[PDB]
Design a protein around this ligand. Structure first.
Ligand SMILES: Cc1cn([C@H]2C=C[C@@H](COP(=O)(O)OP(=O)(O)OP(=O)(O)O)O2)c(=O)[nH]c1=O
Ligand SMILES: [Mg+2]
Ligand SMILES: [Mg+2]
Lengths: 412, 555
DNA sequence: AACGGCGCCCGAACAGGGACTG
DNA sequence: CAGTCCCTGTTCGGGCGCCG
């Protein structure tokens, strides 16, 4: 009884044609059980090879959850419908969400399964379930309703979501509610007891209309930043000063007031690296002035909503991971550091996966965008393992880099 | 008025703005003429082919080739122009079934659908785009032109449509027989069950009659009831499997196309024969671009080919997959960037073997390549068994721990244990984390002229040691590596080295043990001989310490 | 002389960053 | 500041194996 909102691709772009990648046994058995129930409910329908489109599919388990969750990699389809969920029916981003003391994330993507999908657009949501040892050919489906993980789903459902959240927002004018992909970000300054009570009231408000029982909690008021800091030693060697001048010279690309004149004068000659060099009066002055500039904020650094976010991550060792978010080089909007995450001291890929999820979550809360990641890892290493550790219902864009640490800039 | 088959049709369109095929026939031999007129007549009576007239302004040439191990001929339609104008299909064939992924079944039957493509109907509105003429005489009778009501052999949409149509017909039977495994690859059907031999034939006949309801025939000439079964090019025995006998050519003179077929068979043989190498054979397939050019076999390529033939002498076999037992994968280093592995569940009962010999990167080490081999085995194991095997690797836990904790890139190996079988993989040198007290400090630098390709490389040290070496036909990057090589040559067992070259430092910090560059291989040899090496980097052209001094010498 | 599938080893074309020269 | 170079990386299409 609902008219299908017409959906069109961006002009001059065809649908996605991405090959399905191999899935483990437990993931194939999970998707077969899930898709059988979705077909019986009419959410998806089987298709044939005359549909040349395809999008990868796999399954995940959220944190502290033993239930399998179907996850479609609509990253290609999403950027082929960008003029829809950003120009036509965009979702405004509240600047106060990052200021709330607590923010709960609610998986509301199940609600999208009640709105029909435009018939002329269903062919683009095609996916293929693989089989172990290629016992059977791929089992292809397409979506009949708004699919989870597609950016067009929250945009079309937004009019329905507004009406559902209308009584709750009136009841609580202080609560900030933001919607991104399949998730609902609910932030309040209420105490932990009061917050979770208000979250449960929102859950019951949605029930009177399979992962609604979960609530991942955030605290953006506690989110820290990792500035560039200079070492403080009692004695300085030639090697210490060479590293310091190297760090300051690179930091000058960000802070143009940094000077290295007096510090470089300490190395006049051809000295042994372990020779102790006493800091002169001017050297102490220049180093003290540089420590103050690194505390001052960078000039002309602000968020441009028209530009993409970019995230770089550095493996610092011993479970330490630093990251920077920016839109223009050396104009970082945020710098941080993670330590002692899951997989620390045993699994780089799990740690890097966790870091990508944390950074993306922070970017959704602060700006409402996900960044494109520059991952310090080989493509084959990441693509072999990352789905084993993914616990989010969205997927960011990423590319692969290899930058040897010539100077430890973000972590001494 | 042709009957409609029970198989649901597949709606096939064309790319917009384009029409059907209009290609003239190809003059063929009279032997092919007397082998196609009988086909178009039999398919006309059976309804598989209808005759058209002048209202079909299309044409497409066809040819015929003998079937493999059969008196019957095979007809193929050259739809290369139709495929360029036909819509794209998504292939539902995602891979190739492997016998090592099969589980033990008490009873096994291998079927083969007769006239596969000729039993699935074509789209109604698409049959008009398949026009072709058949001259009864090579230059006398104009020949009546026919069309296709089924899937033609040669059309790019025929495989995908048949594989999807076959699945829809088997789905009700598989739902009625859950405990029966049916491996479905193209028209061949592998059917296995733990039922008794008598009860197994009962369900087989039920399946043969189920397919018959949709017009799919399973003749007796390609019905296999007795092991060994010929399936996907393998010999399936009740408790083991092996590849069909592989014959390597033995020509007195070897060209280029002969080696391409030789390395191919060896790649196919490496899935069950342990220890196959194709490094030196494929090394001959470089530079020369003439498939009909004779290439002499090198002494290394001859010894490699000899050791592969002796491996193929003794008969080998794989076993089947038992899900109640764990998956084990063990790797050995074959030398020269070559790795071989075995996947098994019980000791000395290999499910399959394989090799990894890809050389990626100009500079690398054994640990990187072992990590790549693990990733290849992992992905291969998820395709075949849907799970990652436990690894047995010839690398110490301490060696691996030192590498991955200190490497700047994320790297990881799944659950694994150390197996002490030389040659063990190790790191051949370790760069110091701090400058060395008492070791001479070398400030190195190199510069080259872009035009004349002339350059200098040298160093200055804290003790007054100094060298400048003029170089010809070089680059800035080469002179920076040469400067480090000079400092390693002229220093004691412990040395500190300060360079401004991000290029050189990036190579050496990754601890390579092999390189396509002779200069880097010489630098590695020096690094192995040292007891302590500390590399430090400073920005160039900043008046920093001895770097400012050696910069003057070389520029 | 046809189509589709997967695997390997090869080279040409292309991309991207330090670094030098106008 | 651009436009090159040197060098190293990925992508892709074809060679071969093999299946149908
Ligand atoms: C071997 C082969 C096969 N095919 C297509 C056609 C039918 C299926 C199976 O071929 P087949 O089993 O050998 O012959 P088929 O048509 O089934 O007839 P039968 O010999 O089984 O009776 O794949 C093809 O297009 N080109 C080929 O070279
Ligand atoms: Mg057949
Ligand atoms: Mg230099």
């Amino acid at each position: 009884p609902i008219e299908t909102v017409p959906v069109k691709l961006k002009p001059g772009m065809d649908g996605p044609k991405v090959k399905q990648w191999p899935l483990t046994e437990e993931k194939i058995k999970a998707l077969v059980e899930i898709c059988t129930e979705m077909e019986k409910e009419g959410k998806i329908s089987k298709i044939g090879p005359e549909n040349p489109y395809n999008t990868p599919v796999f399954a995940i388990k959220k944190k502290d959850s033993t239930k399998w969750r179907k996850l479609v990699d609509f990253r290609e389809l999403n950027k082929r419908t960008q003029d829809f969920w950003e120009v036509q029916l965009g979702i405004p981003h509240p600047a106060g969400l990052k200021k709330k003391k607590s923010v709960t994330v609610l998986d509301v993507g199940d609600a999208y399964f009640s709105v029909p999908l435009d018939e002329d657009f269903r062919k683009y949501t095609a996916f293929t379930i693989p089989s172990i040892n290629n016992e059977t050919p791929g089992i292809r489906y397409q979506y009949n309703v708004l699919p989870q993980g597609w950016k067009g789903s929250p945009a079309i459902f937004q009019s329905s979501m507004t009406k559902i959240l209308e009584p709750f927002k009136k009841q609580n004018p202080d609560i900030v509610i933001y919607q991104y992909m399949d998730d609902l970000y609910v932030g309040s300054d209420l105490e932990i007891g009061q917050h979770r009570t208000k979250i449960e009231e929102l859950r019951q408000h949605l029930l009177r209309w399979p992962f609604l029982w979960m609530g991942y909690e955030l605290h953006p008021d506690k989110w820290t930043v990792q500035p560039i800091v200079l070492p403080e030693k009692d004695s300085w060697t030639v090697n210490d000063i060479q590293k310091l001048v190297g760090k300051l010279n690179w930091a000058s690309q960000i802070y143009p007031g940094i000077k290295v004149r007096q510090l470089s004068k300490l190395l006049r000659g051809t000295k042994a690296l372990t020779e102790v060099i006493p800091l002169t009066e001017e050297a102490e002055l220049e180093l003290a002035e540089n420590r103050e500039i690194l505390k001052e904020p960078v000039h002309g650094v602000y968020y441009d909503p028209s530009k993409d976010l970019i995230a770089e991550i550095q493996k610092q060792g011993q479970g330490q991971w630093t990251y920077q978010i920016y839109q223009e080089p050396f104009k970082n909007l945020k710098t941080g550091k993670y330590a002692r995450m899951r997989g620390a001291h045993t699994n780089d890929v799990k740690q890097l996966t966790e870091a990508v999820q944390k950074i993306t979550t922070e970017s959704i809360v602060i700006w409402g965008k996900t960044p494109k990641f520059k991952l310090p890892i080989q493509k084959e290493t990441w693509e072999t393992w990352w789905t084993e550790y993914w616990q989010a219902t969205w997927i960011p864009e990423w590319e692969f880099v290899n930058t040897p640490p010539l100077v430890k800039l973000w972590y001494q | 008025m042709v009957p409609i088959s029970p198989i649901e049709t597949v709606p096939v369109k064309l790319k917009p703005g384009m029409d059907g095929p209009k290609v003239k026939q190809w003059p063929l031999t009279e032997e092919k003429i007397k082998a196609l007129v009988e086909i178009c007549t039999e398919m006309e009576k059976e309804g598989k082919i209808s005759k058209i007239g002048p209202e079909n302004p299309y044409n497409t040439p066809v040819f015929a080739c003998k079937k493999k191990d059969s008196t019957k001929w095979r007809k193929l339609v050259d739809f290369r122009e139709l495929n360029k104008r036909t819509q794209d299909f998504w292939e539902v064939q995602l891979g190739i079934p492997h016998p090592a992924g099969l589980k033990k079944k008490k009873s096994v039957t291998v079927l083969d659908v007769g006239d596969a493509y000729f039993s699935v109907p074509l789209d109604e509105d698409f049959r008009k785009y398949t026009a072709f003429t058949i001259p009864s005489i090579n230059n006398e009778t104009p020949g009546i032109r026919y069309q296709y009501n089924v899937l033609p052999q040669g059309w790019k949409g025929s495989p995908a449509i048949f594989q999807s149509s076959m699945t829809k017909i088997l789905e009700p039977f598989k739902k009625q027989n859950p405990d029966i495994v049916i491996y479905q690859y193209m028209d061949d059907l592998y059917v296995g069950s733990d039922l008794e031999i008598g009860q197994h034939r009962t369900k087989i006949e039920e399946l043969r009659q189920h397919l018959l309801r949709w017009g799919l025939t399973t003749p007796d000439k390609k019905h296999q009831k007795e092991p060994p079964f010929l399936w996907m090019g393998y010999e399936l025995h009740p408790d083991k499997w092996t590849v069909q006998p592989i014959v390597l050519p033995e020509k007195d003179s070897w060209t280029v196309n002969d080696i391409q077929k030789l390395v191919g068979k060896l790649n196919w043989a490496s899935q069950i024969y342990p220890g196959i190498k194709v490094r030196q054979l494929s090394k001959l397939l470089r530079g020369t671009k003439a498939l009909t050019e004779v290439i002499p076999l090198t002494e290394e390529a001859e010894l490699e080919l000899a050791e592969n033939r002796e491996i193929l002498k003794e008969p080998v076999h794989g076993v089947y997959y038992d899900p109640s037992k764990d998956l084990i994968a063990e790797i050995q280093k074959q030398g020269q960037g070559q790795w071989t592995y075995q996947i098994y569940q019980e000791p000395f009962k290999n499910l399959k073997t394989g090799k990894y010999a890809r050389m990626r990167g100009a500079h690398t080490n054994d640990v990187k390549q072992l990590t790549e081999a693990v990733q290849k085995i992992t992905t291969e194991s998820i395709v075949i068994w849907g799970k990652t095997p436990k690894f047995k690797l010839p690398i110490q836990k301490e060696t691996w721990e030192t590498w991955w904790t200190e490497y700047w890139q994320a790297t990881w190996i799944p659950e694994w244990e150390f197996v002490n079988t030389p040659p063990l993989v190790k790191l051949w040198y370790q760069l110091e984390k701090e400058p060395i007290v008492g070791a001479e400090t070398f400030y190195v630098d190199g510069a080259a002229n872009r035009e004349t390709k002339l350059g200098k490389a040298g160093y200055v040290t804290n003790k007054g040691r100094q060298k400048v070496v003029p170089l010809t036909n070089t680059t800035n990057q080469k002179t920076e590596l040469q400067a480090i090589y000079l400092a390693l040559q002229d220093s004691g067992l412990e040395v500190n080295i300060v360079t401004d070259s991000q290029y050189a430092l990036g190579i050496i910090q990754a601890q390579p043990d092999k390189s396509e560059s002779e200069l880097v291989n010489q630098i590695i040899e020096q690094l192995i001989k040292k007891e302590k090496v500390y590399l430090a980097w400073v920005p160039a052209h900043k008046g920093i310490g001895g770097n400012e001094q050696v910069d003057k010498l070389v520029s």
